[PDB]
Amino acid sequence: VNFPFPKKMITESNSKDIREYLASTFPFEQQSTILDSVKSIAKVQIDDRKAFDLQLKFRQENLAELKDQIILSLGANNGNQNWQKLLDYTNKLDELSNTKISPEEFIEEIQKVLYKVKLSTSKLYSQFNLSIQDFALQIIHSKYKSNQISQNDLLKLITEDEMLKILAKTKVLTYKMKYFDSASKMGINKYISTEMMDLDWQFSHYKTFNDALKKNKASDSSYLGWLTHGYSIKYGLSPNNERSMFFQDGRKYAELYAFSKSPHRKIIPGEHLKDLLAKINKSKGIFLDQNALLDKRIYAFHELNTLETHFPGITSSFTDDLKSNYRKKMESVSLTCQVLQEIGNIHRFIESKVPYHSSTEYGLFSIPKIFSIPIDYKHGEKENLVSYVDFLYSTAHERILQDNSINQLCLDPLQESLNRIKSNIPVFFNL
C-alpha cells in the first residue's frame, strides 16, 4: 500500500504556528527551509546574536569534550600515535578561541596549525584530525562574525590556494563521516548533492564563506565548486566505476574558465572544447533515456547540474532542449534532493523524542550533552511535525512534472519516503 499524498494549500494561519515552532525549537532555528519559497509564510522575527553566542557555547563545550576524550585515549592506546600532539593542537585551539588578539597573530597561528595538520594507523584518529580542522575553521567563521576581523584580510586568508584546497576536503569528508550511515539506512544516499551541502546547521559557516566569494570574486567561487565536486567523486560518494571525464584534471578548469570569460569560443571550439562538448552531449543522452539504469542517470544528473550551476550556459543547445524539455526535469530532481535532505533531517530529529536516546544521532561531537535536547514532548510538537511533513509533501507535489520517463527519479523516492515516514511516525508517537 502507498499512502496518498496530502493535498493542502498553504495558509497563513497554520503558517504562524509552524513558523514560531521552527523559530523556537533548537535544531530548526539555524536551518532555513524550502517553505520560505512559498507566497505567504512570512513573519520570521529572528535575531542571530543569541544563536551566535549559542554557537560559541556549543563550540566551547565540544572542544572541551573531545579534549576530555583525548587524555584518556592517550592513556590506553594500541600503538602510540603521538596523541599529545593532537592534544597540543586542541590546546592552541582553545587558546586562540578564548582570548581577543590582534588580527595578524590570529592569521599566523591559524595558518600554522592548519598547514601542519595537512600532513593512517587508526580511523578515529583521523576522525579527531578532521574534527580539529573543522573546529579551527568554525573558529575562523565565528571570529569573522564577531567583527574582530575585516573583509580584506579574510579574503587574503581564504583566497590563497592551500585554503581553497582544504575547504572542499573538509566540507565533503565531514559530511560523509557524519551522515553517510544515516543516509544509507534511510535509503536516500543515492540522492546527495554537493550543491545542497551548505543547507544544514552543521555546515552553515561554509555557506558564509561561499557568499563571501560571491561578494568579491565569482571566479574563485566557481573554482571552489568545481573543486568540491571532484573531491566528492574521489572519496566515493558517487561511484562511476570507470573514470570522470572533466573533474579531476587541471587542464579542464582552464578551458571552462576561458569559455566563461569569452563565450564565443563555444561557436568556434578548439579540440579540448570539442571533446568537452561531445562528452556533455553523451552524458545528456544517457540522462534522458528511461530504461537505462538508475545510478547512471543519477550520476549524469549530478555532473550536469554542477556544470550548469557553476558555468552557466555551457550545457545549453537551443533546438533539442525543447523537444527533450529536460530543464524543468533538472529543476524537479533538484527540488527532490532538497526535500529529501529535509525529510532525513526530520527523521533524525525524531530520535531526540525517544525516551532513552542520550546518544546523539547526528555524529561525533554534533551536540554537547550540556544541552542534549530532551524527550519533553511539548504542546505544539505532536501537531506541528505532522503538519510540517504534510506541508512539505504538498509544496513538493505541485512543481514536480509528471512523466514516467522522469517519474523514475523524483516520484518514487518521495512516495517511498512518505511511506516510511507515515509508517514510523505513529510507533514513535506512542512511546
Partner: protein
C-alpha cells in the same frame, strides 16, 4: 661452438642479400595492372612473398636473441628455408614456356549527351567568370587556371562544358589529354593537329624532335588569342616541358589544366586564387541525379525504398561516378530489383569493373615504398576517423619506414609519407593537432572497399566480422589480425607467426582470446578495450609498440625492462599511479605518453633518443631530476605541468631547456600566480616554431625580453596572457617574421577591475606579414591598429569595444581579406542609447566592406 657462431653469421649475411633481391623483383612485378600479368608469374610471386616473410622472421630472431639451444634452432630454420628457396626455383624453371591493347575507359565519357548532366550551370558560370572577369579581359596578360580533386569528380566534364560555351570569342583552341606515362612528341603533335586540321593534317607522321615541334607551335600562335585546355597531368616534368610553347606574351589568351595532384596545380598557377577545387554535389542534386538515372520518367521513389536509398546515397558521398555506377547496377533495365536485394547490395558487371579500373590509377602510380603504408589503412573500421600519430608510430613499428642517411629522424620521414598521401587526394584531412599538424583523416567508402579487397588478396590483413569477412577458408599462416565483431570466437592455435593484433570491440569477449602464445609480436594495440591487467607483456621480447590507452590497467609488471626493443609506450586514461623502476632500462625508446598525475622514477636521463615526451609531472622532485632533463638532446616535443613544482629552481629548468637544440613545440601549464621561470637572458632554442601557455589565469609580467625577431626567427603560433598590455607591445609582435597565429589575454581587465585601454600603432607599414588570425581578447581597436594597410592576409579578428567610445572610425577597408569579425561590447559605462547606436554603427561598417564579413556582438 665458435664455428656455430661463424656459420650462423655467414648464413645471415646471405639471407640479407637474398632479401634485397627478392624485394627488387616483387616491386618490379607489382607495377603491372592485373590485366597484363599471366598466371605463372602471379603464382610464383605469391610464393616468393611467403618465403620473404619467413626469412625476415629468422633474421629478426637472430638479431634479438643474440645460447646453445637458440643457435641450434636458428641453424635448423636456416637450413630449411634455404632448401625451400632452391625447390621453388627449380619448380619455376620446370614449366616456363615463352610461346591487343585496350582503350582508356574514360574516353567514352566525352561522348555523353549534354541533356544528362544535372547541376552544372552554377559551376560552369563561375568558371567562365573566373576566366573572362571584366570588360577588358581581352587586354590583360596570359592567365592559367587549374582544377583539382579526386577521380570521378567531374573535372574534365566541367572543362569541356566551359570550353564549348566560350570557344567562340577566341581565334584558335585545342583540347588535349596527357596520360600517366606520356610521350612528349605525341602531345605536341596533338596540340598542332587540334589547332588546324587542314594545314597540319599529316603532322602525326612527321619525324622531328621536340625542339622543332615547339618552334612550329610558337610560330603558329603569333598574334592570336587562344584558349587551350590540358587534361590529366600526373607530374611536374610534363608541365615543365609543355610550358615552353607558351613562352611569348600574348594579351587575352587563356590556359586551363586539370589534375588529381595538388603540387602540380600549385606549380601551374601563379596565385593561389587561380585554383578551382572541385567539391561533390549536394544532397538534393545527388538525389535528383539518382532518380533520373533509375526511375527516369516516373521520378517517384516508392516508400519502402526511401531509407535504403538514403543510406546508399550517404555511402556514395556525392561523387557522380559512384552514383551513376550504382544506379545502373540497381536499375537492371529489364526490372527494378527487390527491396531485400537493395539491402543485400547495401551491406555488400561491366560498369563496376570500369569504376574499379579507373580508381586504381592513383594506386598504381604511387612510389613502391608507399604501397604498404596505404594498405595498412584497411585495419580500421568503416566510417570513423583515424589519428595520424597512431598511424605514424605503427608504420615505424612495423618496419615500413627506414633510410640510410646518418642524420635523419624517422618521425619526420613518416610525417612526410602522410603528407604525400594527402597530397595525392587519397585521404581527407581533418582538424588541427595540438602540435600544429593535421589531427585525423578520413577515407571514402568505395576506396575502402577497393583497399580491403587488394589487401585480402595477399594475406596482408585478416578482418574478423561475423556477417561478412569470416576466417579464410584454407589459410594456416595469418600475420595481421583485426577484431571488429566480438561475437566470433578465435582458434589462435595455428597462428604461430603473428605480427600485429588490434581489437576494436568495447566487448568483454574481446579480452577473452589468449595472447601469451604469440611469441613473436611487434604491435599490440588494445586502445579502448576494457582489459584490466596484463602480466604476460613480458616474455614477448619482440614488441615495438605497446598501446594501452583508455583501458582499466592499474599497474605494470616490473619486467618491462626486458623489452630492449620498444619504440612507443602509450599510457593515457589508465589508472596507473607510479611507474615501475625498471622502465629506466629501455634504451631504445622514442615516444612516451603519460598523464601528469603519474610518478616517474629517478634515472630518466638514460632514455636518450626520446623524441616526444608528454605531460611531465614536475612535482615533488629534487634538482638532479631537473638536471637530468638536460641530457635528452634530440627531443622535439615537450609538455610540462608545474603543479607542485617549487618555483625556486626555475633557473636550472630553463638551462636544461636551452640545452635542447632541436625542438619544435613547447607547453607550460601553470594553475595560478606569476610564472617564475623562463627569465630574461635565456637564449631559447633556435628552431622553435610553436609556443603556448594555456593557463589563462597565470600571467606574465610586462613581456619576455627574448621575443625579439632575431632570437625567434621561426614562429607560427603564440598564446600568452599578460598582466597589463602596453601600446608598444603589439609593435614587437609586428616585428616577428611569420607569426601566422596569435592570441593575447589581458589579465588585469578580467581578474582586476582595470578598464579597456585603446592601443595605438605607429611608425611602420607591413606590421603583420602573414597573420591570418588574431584574437586580442581584452584589448580592441580596428582602425588605429592597422595604419596604411598592414596585415593584408587577416581573415578573423577578435576585439573588444566599450560602448563609451561611441564618439575613431570603424572603416574596414584597410584590410582586404577580412571574412569574419567577433566583437563584444561593454555597456555599463554608457547608456543603452549609445549601445544600440554603436551596434548599428559597426554593423554598417561591416556591411560597407566588399567581402561582407560576419559579425557577432555578444
Amino acid at each position: 661452438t665458435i664455428t656455430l657462431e661463424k656459420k650462423v653469421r655467414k648464413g645471415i649475411e646471405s639471407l640479407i642479400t637474398e632479401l634485397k633481391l627478392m624485394q627488387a623483383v616483387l616491386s618490379k612485378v607489382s607495377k603491372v595492372p592485373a590485366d597484363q600479368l599471366d598466371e605463372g608469374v602471379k603464382i610464383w610471386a605469391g610464393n616468393v612473398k611467403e618465403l620473404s616473410y619467413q626469412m625476415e622472421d629468422i633474421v629478426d630472431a637472430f638479431m634479438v636473441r643474440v645460447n646453445g639451444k637458440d643457435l641450434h634452432r636458428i641453424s635448423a630454420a636456416l637450413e630449411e628455408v634455404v632448401l625451400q628457396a632452391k625447390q621453388l626455383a627449380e619448380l619455376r624453371q620446370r614449366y616456363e614456356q615463352e610461346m591487343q591493347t585496350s582503350v582508356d575507359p574514360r574516353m567514352m565519357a566525352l561522348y555523353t549527351d549534354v541533356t544528362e548532366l544535372v547541376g552544372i550551370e552554377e559551376t560552369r558560370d563561375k568558371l567562365i567568370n573566373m576566366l573572362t572577369e571584366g570588360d577588358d579581359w581581352s587586354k590583360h596578360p596570359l592567365k592559367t587556371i587549374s582544377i583539382v580533386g579526386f577521380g570521378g569528380l567531374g573535372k574534365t566534364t566541367l572543362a569541356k562544358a566551359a570550353y564549348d560555351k566560350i570557344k567562340v570569342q577566341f581565334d584558335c583552341g585545342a583540347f588535349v589529354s596527357v596520360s600517366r606515362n606520356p610521350e612528349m612528341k605525341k602531345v605536341l603533335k596533338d596540340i598542332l593537329y587540334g589547332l588546324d586540321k587542314v594545314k597540319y593534317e599529316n603532322i602525326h607522321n612527321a619525324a622531328r624532335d621536340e625542339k622543332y615541334l615547339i618552334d612550329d607551335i610558337i610560330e603558329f600562335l603569333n598574334d592570336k588569342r587562344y584558349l587551350i585546355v590540358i587534361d590529366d597531368i600526373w607530374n611536374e616534368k610534363a608541365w615543365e616541358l609543355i610550358k615552353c610553347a607558351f613562352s611569348k606574351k600574348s594579351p587575352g589568351s587563356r590556359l586551363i589544366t586539370t589534375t588529381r595532384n595538388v603540387s602540380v596545380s600549385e606549380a601551374c598557377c601563379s596565385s593561389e586564387d587561380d585554383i578551382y577545387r572541385m567539391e561533390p554535389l549536394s544532397n538534393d542534386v545527388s538525389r535528383t541525379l539518382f532518380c533520373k538515372r533509375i526511375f527516369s520518367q516516373e521520378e517517384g521513389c516508392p516508400q519502402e525504398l526511401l531509407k535504403v536509398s538514403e543510406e546508399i546515397l550517404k555511402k556514395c558521398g556525392g561523387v557522380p561516378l559512384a552514383i551513376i555506377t550504382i544506379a545502373s547496377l540497381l536499375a537492371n533495365k529489364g526490372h527494378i530489383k527487390a527491396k531485400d536485394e537493395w539491402y543485400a547490395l547495401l551491406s555488400s558487371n561491366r560498369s563496376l569493373e570500369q569504376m574499379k579500373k579507373i580508381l586504381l590509377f592513383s594506386y598504381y602510380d604511387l612510389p613502391s615504398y608507399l604501397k604498404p603504408c596505404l594498405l595498412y589503412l584497411s585495419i580500421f573500421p568503416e566510417d570513423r576517423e583515424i589519428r595520424r600519430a597512431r598511424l605514424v608510430w605503427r608504420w615505424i613499428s612495423e618496419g615500413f619506414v627506414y633510410s640510410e642517411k646518418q642524420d635523419i629522424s624517422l618521425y619526420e620521414l613518416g610525417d612526410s609519407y602522410f603528407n604525400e598521401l594527402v597530397n595525392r587526394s587519397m585521404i581527407q584531412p581533418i582538424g588541427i593537432d595540438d602540435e600544429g599538424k593535421v589531427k585525423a583523416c578520413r577515407v571514402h567508402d568505395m576506396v575502402l572497399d577497393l583497399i580491403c579487397s587488394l589487401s585480402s588478396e595477399e594475406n596482408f590483413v585478416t578482418i574478423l566480422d561475423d556477417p561478412r569477412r569470416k576466417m579464410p577458408n584454407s589459410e594456416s599462416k595469418v600475420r595481421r589480425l583485426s577484431i571488429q565483431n566480438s561475437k566470433i570466437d578465435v582458434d589462435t592455435t595455428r597462428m604461430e607467426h603473428m605480427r600485429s593484433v588490434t581489437v576494436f570491440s568495447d566487448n568483454v569477449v574481446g579480452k577473452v582470446l589468449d595472447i601469451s602464445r604469440f611469441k613473436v609480436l611487434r604491435v599490440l594495440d588494445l586502445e579502448g578495450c576494457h582489459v584490466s591487467d596484463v602480466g604476460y607483456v613480458g616474455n614477448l621480447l619482440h614488441l615495438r609498440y605497446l598501446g594501452l590507452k583508455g583501458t582499466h590497467v592499474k599497474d605494470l609488471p616490473m619486467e618491462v625492462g626486458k623489452l630492449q626493443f620498444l619504440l612507443t609506450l602509450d599510457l593515457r586514461g589508465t589508472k596507473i599511479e607510479v611507474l615501475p623502476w625498471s622502465v629506466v632500462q629501455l634504451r631504445r625508446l622514442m615516444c612516451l605518453y603519460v598523464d601528469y598525475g603519474m610518478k616517474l622514477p629517478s634515472g630518466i636521463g638514460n632514455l636518450t633518443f626520446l623524441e616526444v615526451l608528454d605531460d611531465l609531472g614536475l612535482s615533488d622532485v629534487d634538482l638532479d631530476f631537473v638536471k637530468e632533463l638536460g641530457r635528452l638532446t634530440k627531443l622535439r616535443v615537450l609538455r610540462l605541468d608545474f603543479h607542485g613544482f617549487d618555483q625556486s629552481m626555475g633557473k636550472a629548468l630553463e638551462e636544461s631547456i636551452s640545452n635542447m637544440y632541436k625542438l619544435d613545440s613547447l607547453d607550460v601549464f601553470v594553475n595560478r600566480g606569476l610564472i617564475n621561470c623562463l627569465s630574461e637572458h635565456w637564449v631559447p632554442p633556435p628552431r622553435l616554431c610553436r609556443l603556448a601557455f594555456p593557463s589563462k589565469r597565470s600571467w606574465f609580467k610586462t613581456l619576455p625580453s627574448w621575443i625579439n625577431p632575431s632570437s625567434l626567427p621561426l614562429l607560427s603560433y603564440l598564446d600568452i596572457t599578460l598582466f597589463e598590455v602596453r601600446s608598444e607591445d603589439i609593435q614587437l609582435l609586428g616585428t616577428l617574421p611569420a607569426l601566422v597565429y596569435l592570441e593575447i589575454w589581458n589579465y588585469s581587465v578580467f581578474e582586476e577591475a582595470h578598464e579597456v585601454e585603446a592601443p595605438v600603432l605607429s611608425s611602420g607599414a607591413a606590421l603583420f606579414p602573414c597573420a591570418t588570425e588574431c584574437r586580442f581578447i581584452g584589448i580592441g581597436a580596428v582602425p588605429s591598429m592597422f595604419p596604411q594597410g598592414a596585415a593584408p592576409r587577416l581573415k578573423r579578428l577578435w576585439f573588444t569595444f566599450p560602448a563609451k567610445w561611441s564618439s575613431i572610425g570603424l572603416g574596414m577597408r584597410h584590410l582586404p581579406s577580412l571574412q569574419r569579425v567577433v566583437v563584444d561590447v561593454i555597456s555599463e559605462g554608457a547608456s543603452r542609447e549609445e549601445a544600440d547606436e554603436a551596434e548599428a554603427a559597426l554593423r554598417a561598417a561591416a556591411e560597407d566592406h566588399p567581402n561582407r564579413p560576419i559579425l557577432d556582438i555578444w
